[PDB]
Design a protein around this ligand. Structure first.
Ligand SMILES: *[C@@H]1O[C@H](CO)[C@@H](O[C@@H]2O[C@H](CO)[C@@H](O)[C@H](O)[C@H]2NC(C)=O)[C@H](O)[C@H]1NC(C)=O
Ligand code: NAG
Ligand code: NAG
Ligand code: BGC
Ligand code: BGC
Ligand code: BGC
Ligand code: FUC
Ligand code: CA
Ligand code: CA
Ligand code: CA
Lengths: 115, 227
């Protein structure tokens, strides 16, 4: 009906739908406003933890993690000792984007594997 | 992309034509640049160019002034997949290539000359922020900014305005992205005609500017006379 009168009033490839005696836009995901002219800020809810950075993207957000963190919300501290890296029964200590091996006496090296 | 990071290279000095490894460029340092843009990080640099990267052809040999080329372009353009965070990290590398200047980045013999690393806050705007980096071997002079793409507006480039002169609107675009109504129109999208002066607010109306039409039961030029 009314969508027929002119060039698509809905920005960003939105979908015009006639309503009685006027009209409305069905916007593609990530866009808002009556004529879809506004880029929705998906980072408003502050989903990103541990000093991560939230990138507002089109229809979705992305969290860029500080080094050593992972997961959708950067809510997971990566376990650098999961693979059991330390040799000669050294003690792995999980740190921030790091792992420290504490050697028993007489052993040295990063993985505590020496004379 | 709704916004663009623009970087203008202005001057580079390498008077003794040396490489990072201490060897002299032979015969001269045929210099091209590599740009790595990413999110702000204070810790020692980790990982890829998250905001994008670009390389230039060779712009000069040893010391040279770099001039703009609207259409080897300068300023360089990095179009962004996201709303501008407000902070950033920028890494600029100066390189020497012994090969031909077409995509020097793909050439096998390349050697680094020097590089700089900056980080900070930047607001979207047309003003160029200017910087210099001096060291004993080389000097780099440049400036940068973040501006909206065509038809994007606002402090975060999140508002789109495209001018119309048809049934849905009659407007131009203001700097903030709000429509600026052509004469005789009103409303947010400038789709409301301004009826003839004194046309009765309740009893009269217009579909065209400077007109007065009467609703049922009314008459006169201003539609204010009952029956
Ligand atoms: C880096 O070097 C340039 C030129 O070698 C410097 O530019 C001059 O800076 C002085 C003060 O430092 C000004 O009085 C001059 O007017 C500048 N030259 C021109 C042509 O404008 C620049 O200042 C140096 N940067 C630093 C931090 O010392
Ligand atoms: C540089 O950009 C290209 C695409 O333009 C991408 O494939 C590559 O991974 C980027 N490099 C880094 C280090 O981010
Ligand atoms: C960049 O933007 C396009 C469309 O705007 C999207 O399809 C693409 O996935 C984006 N890139 C990333 C890495 O999300
Ligand atoms: O001019 C078209 C008009 O149609 C109807 C809508 O609800 C209005 O928002 C729009 O201005
Ligand atoms: C706020 O956090 C929610 C998680 O429920 C996320 O889905 C939204 O995109 C974000 O704005
Ligand atoms: C397994 O071991 C590797 C050693 O390279 C370590 O880097 C990982 O953190 C761990 O999972
Ligand atoms: C976005 O990335 C995170 C990891 C931090 O470095 C922030 O300071 C930045 O804004
Ligand atoms: Ca209708
Ligand atoms: Ca968005
Ligand atoms: Ca850890």
């Amino acid at each position: 009906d009314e969508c027929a009168l002119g060039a698509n009033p809905c920005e960003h490839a939105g979908k015009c739908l006639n309503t009685l005696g006027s009209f409305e836009c069905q916007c593609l995901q990530g866009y808002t406003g009556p004529r879809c002219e506004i880029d929705v800020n998906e980072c408003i809810s502050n989903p990103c933890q541990n000093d991560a950075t939230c990138l507002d993207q089109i229809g979705e957000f992305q969290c860029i993690c500080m080094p050593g963190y992972e997961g959708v919300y950067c809510e997971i501290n990566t376990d650098e000792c999961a693979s059991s890296p330390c040799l000669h029964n050294g003690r792995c200590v999980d740190k921030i984007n790091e792992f420290l091996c504490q050697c028993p006496k007489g052993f040295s090296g990063h993985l505590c594997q020496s004379g | 992309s709704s916004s663009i990071f623009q970087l203008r290279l202005q001057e580079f000095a390498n008077e003794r034509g040396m490489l990072a490894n201490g060897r002299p460029c032979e015969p001269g340092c045929r210099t091209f640049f590599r740009i790595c843009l990413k999110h702000y990080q204070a810790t020692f640099s980790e990982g890829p160019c998250t905001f994008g990267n670009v390389s230039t052809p060779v712009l000069g040999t040893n010391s040279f002034v770099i001039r703009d080329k609207n259409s080897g372009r300068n300023p360089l353009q990095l179009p962004l997949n996201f709303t501008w965070p407000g902070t950033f990290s920028l890494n600029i590398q100066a390189w020497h290539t012994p090969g031909d200047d077409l995509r020097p980045e793909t050439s096998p013999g390349n050697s680094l000359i020097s590089q700089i690393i900056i980080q900070g806050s930047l607001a979207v705007g047309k003003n160029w922020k200017s910087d210099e980096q001096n060291n004993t071997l080389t000097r780099l002079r440049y400036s940068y900014r973040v501006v909206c793409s065509d038809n994007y507006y606002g402090d975060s480039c999140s508002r789109l305005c495209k001018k119309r002169d048809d049934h849905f609107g009659h407007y131009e675009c203001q700097p903030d992205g709000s429509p600026s109504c052509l004469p005789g129109w009103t409303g947010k999208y400038c789709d409301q005609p301004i009826c003839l002066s004194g046309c009765h607010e309740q009893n009269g109306y217009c579909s065209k500017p400077d007109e007065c039409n009467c609703r049922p039961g009314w008459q006169g030029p201003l539609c204010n006379e009952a029956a």
